[PDB]
Assembly symmetry: C3
Homo-oligomer: 308 residues x 3
């Protein structure tokens, strides 16, 4: 027995998001559906396992959960649980809309309860410190709301989806200023540096959720978001040697949410005949990088250095 | 004699804004007009009294005014004066558009002169400190511009209204990042905590002003704003026991601007047949809470603990 | 011989931008074309000279360039080089679209390489300090992307232009919060104060680029941007005596980018019959102020206090 590190939920998260990206190509290229289904089954199976492991953690390692929850930094990774639950719901919708809808509402109520309890509590002061200003804060604050937005739109609740979308989008622009100033001043320690990959996520997760709610219309807002997303991509590419200066590690799955959302949004840009060449590049690049993450993970697994 | 605490202008402000919310229901439910007129007369009467008291303060307690004006924290409450003046103008428009227009321009020129003189002066450095980063800064920086926007639109100056709207909206997104980071790090002292209610205001005041200028069209922007507004509501509800930990007090009128603007925007969402159930909840909730503020205020009055 | 101070590129930048503003009036008032052509030739000639001087600096004063490049404050002025290159390209387009397109791509690739190398590197921490939070950061982070956006739109690449536009716009809203908080707390030393003029630029450069890409449609976004732009103008006017408290100097060309972009955007508001009176005021004001900058510069030149 061992307590599951909560950040491992980033693995089914990235795979699930990538399943959904391929799903959106089925009308252009039918074989995409099989790729999507395989990714989606693997993501769902991994999610089931990790949920069961986390249930074990809650039952037998509760003080570990309590400590992560109260931490002004580590609490954020708990948001991966409802986020992945919703994405698995979105996958399962293709086979069973009833079960999908249950997972989606569980994830939505869960994430909103979580942020309402913990994100707001930080405003009491004295616990969160300047050094707590980490990219992981995007998970409960931003990513969870975007995921609710897109999932609720899937279920047909577009106007409710826009409320969650707005919560996420404005929360993003309200947090990022202080994050980037912090990064400029304070060197993020190597042990946290893989989480720089989460910096890729906001614009791409945002535009993917937006396009899910607005019927795939590639409009001025969507183009604006893509532009900032690619700026951040270029910055993170330049920074990649620094990010991995102490070595390649499993934390690099942090990048997968943004990469998968880049792939998803690319399918919509392509459908809309906007920047098709860029879209092809983005889709291929993101799949190659996630493919590398999978290969590195299988490698770590086949040597027993996966989870503590 | 006593010098009027400037923050008391929040009382006619909240009542006036609530009058305007009910005014906007008259076409759906005719009895709303009487509720609106009663609220509007009470707000106007209280505003007259407080204006006269503040004129007395300027004449006989000028050094108190000077000190509040030069304070990098207390100056903000002075913006309540032109804000309330404009809202009373908006009320009076139903009876006398000429007098309304005079009040609206006085409030608009006044607030813009005030911010231009004092908000900009802060950029000289050395007076404002990190600890000065308070929710009250929204009043001169954000709320005053939104109120000009909506008031000018009432008078038919829609394009000028959009300029004030943009000034307010961008000023809001430019300030809030540093406010929330400050709240996270530094525990706001109990004596200032009721001003947390001002954190509710921006998104709702914003969308109410937007809907006033754009002919009540409930569009993507409006939905986005409502979503972030409700996020903040949920956060502030969770925080409410901490906000009042040292007891219930008259400062809780800080919440009334956001609550009244929630009510106002709800009437437009309802008219537009967008999220009608949420709109009903929002309208009823905000009225109940302001009703509680009024009851608590009458209580304080009937015991002589109103103004110093 | 002497090493050219890099900030002098602000002179052809302001003149070039002003040429483009007058160009956009030719369809309303034909004589505007001659004014535009004169400004454009002067800007281009000054740019050629300064480029040659900077090439000399790279060849014979390379360690000076290295030091400015690695500085977390001084690096930003290097972005003036590709920005001016693109604006000169935009001017030359009226005479030779081939040469214009070459300059535009050189400036675009150059600025994007520059930011990708240097703006991202700051996120490694430990070099940039709180005191490095200066208005000049807008140049590589914001202004360069807006200039690419408008230049690429000129060439017919509207969707690519929107990507650069979005990168600039979101980068602006992400930086400004921390800049204004810094200005509030820390008094910017007189030697840097003329750079306060760069604070005028973002909203106006933004709306000018937006109107260049969206076919001159003066819409809600454009009006919103103008409103915040004028707020900042009013603030900077009030601050002007403090800005120049140690005397008038050549650094005041910092204001010219925002002033010229105010003039440019005014032509589009006027064409669109939106706020025509404000547009006339803005156009005349900005030209008078740049005219004053030119007169003060000729004065300094005719006395040998231009460049070190
Ligand atoms: C899409 C986001 C995936 C995030 C995966 C990266 C984190 C996986 O591991 C996480 O790393 C941390 C830093 O050492 C710890 O603080 C966390 O509790 C942890 O589980
Ligand atoms: C995934 C869900 C994580 C839930 C962990 C909930 C932790 C709440 O734990 C809290 O710690 C408090 C001390 O501050 C005490 O009230 C109690 O120990 C408990 O309420
Ligand atoms: C992701 C699934 C939803 C998360 C449920 C977390 C429940 C948290 O538990 C709550 O924690 C509070 C502190 O913030 C404690 O003080 C409360 O007493 C407790 O009810
Ligand atoms: C960071 C926020 C950027 C917001 C951009 C909103 C741009 C809206 O601009 C509008 O976009 C709509 C769809 O493209 C249409 O009205 C028009 O094409 C355009 O007027
Ligand atoms: C990111 C979205 C990826 C979409 C993959 C598209 C790859 C197809 O490639 C394209 O096929 C077209 C017709 O089908 C050909 O006309 C084009 O020349 C070719 O580039
Ligand atoms: C809508 C905003 C209404 C604000 C009302 C709350 C403030 C009323 O009182 C205010 O409280 C302060 C804090 O103790 C003082 O600093 C102020 O000058 C004061 O008048
Ligand atoms: C509601 C209006 C409030 C107006 C108060 C104006 C206060 C200006 O007071 C200023 O204090 C300065 C010291 O800094 C001195 O110039 C003078 O005392 C005065 O100009
Ligand atoms: C709400 C009504 C409008 C407010 C008018 C306030 C007038 C402020 O008064 C001004 O204060 C300046 C400092 O910022 C002083 O230095 C000036 O000398 C003085 O004219
Ligand atoms: C924080 C800023 C959010 C800006 C959101 C702008 C969204 C505009 O998006 C557009 O909205 C318009 C009205 O809904 C219409 O063009 C379309 O429905 C949509 O394209
Ligand atoms: C926030 C705005 C509040 C609007 C109050 C509406 C309350 C009316 O209630 C509604 O009446 C409808 C017809 O009039 C009925 O058909 C609906 O079932 C009922 O909910
Ligand atoms: C539109 C922007 C024009 C900027 C021109 C102003 C700067 C010109 O000079 C600049 O001033 C600085 C401050 O002393 C130095 O740090 C720079 O390297 C310098 O060249
Ligand atoms: C306008 C273009 C400015 C280019 C200046 C490039 C400066 C790169 O200079 C770098 O300094 C490093 C020390 O940190 C060493 O690698 C080398 O000296 C060099 O690579
Ligand atoms: C404006 C014209 C484009 C600018 C080109 C600048 C080239 C910078 O030069 C680069 O600087 C890096 C540091 O950030 C060095 O470490 C690299 O080795 C070097 O290639
Ligand atoms: C800081 C960001 C402000 C974004 C404002 C977006 C406002 C879009 O609002 C929309 O604007 C479009 C053009 O005016 C049209 O759809 C409509 O007129 C309006 O619905
Ligand atoms: C900022 C853009 C400046 C545009 C300059 C316009 C100046 C023209 O001035 C205008 O001429 C009109 C007809 O041509 C007359 O009908 C108007 O009364 C007059 O104001």
């Amino acid at each position: 027995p061992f307590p599951l590190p909560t950040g491992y939920f980033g693995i089914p998260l990235g795979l699930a998001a990538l399943s959904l990206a391929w799903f959106h190509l089925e009308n252009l290229f039918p074989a995409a559906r099989m790729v999507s289904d395989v990714l989606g089954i693997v993501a769902s199976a991994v999610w089931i396992l990790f949920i069961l492991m986390y249930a074990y953690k809650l039952r037998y390692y509760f003080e570990e959960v309590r400590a992560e929850y109260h931490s002004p930094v580590r609490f954020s990774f708990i948001a991966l649980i409802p986020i992945t639950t919703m994405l698995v719901g979105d996958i399962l919708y293709r086979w069973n809309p009833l079960i999908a809808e249950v997972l989606i509402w569980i994830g939505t109520i869960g994430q909103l309860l979580f942020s309402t309890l913990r994100v707001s509590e930080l405003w009491q002061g004295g616990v969160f410190e300047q050094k707590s200003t980490h990219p992981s804060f995007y998970l409960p604050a931003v990513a969870a709301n975007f995921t609710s937005a897109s999932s609720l739109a899937l279920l047909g609740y577009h106007d409710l989806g826009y409320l969650f979308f707005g919560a996420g989008m404005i929360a993003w622009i309200i947090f990022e200023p202080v994050l980037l100033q912090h990064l400029r001043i304070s060197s993020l320690e190597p042990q946290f540096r893989a989480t720089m990959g989460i910096v890729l996520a906001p614009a791409f997760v945002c535009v993917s959720a937006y396009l899910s709610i607005n019927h795939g219309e590639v409009d001025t807002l969507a183009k604006i978001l893509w532009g900032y997303g690619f700026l951040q991509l270029f910055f993170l590419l330049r920074l990649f040697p620094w990010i991995v200066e102490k070595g390649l590690n499993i934390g690099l799955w942090a990048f997968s949410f943004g990469l998968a959302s880049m792939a998803n949004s690319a399918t919509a840009f392509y459908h809309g005949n906007v920047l098709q060449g860029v879209s092809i590049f983005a889709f291929v690049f993101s799949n190659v990088m996630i493919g590398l993450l999978v290969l590195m993970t299988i490698y770590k697994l086949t040597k027993g250095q996966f989870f503590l």
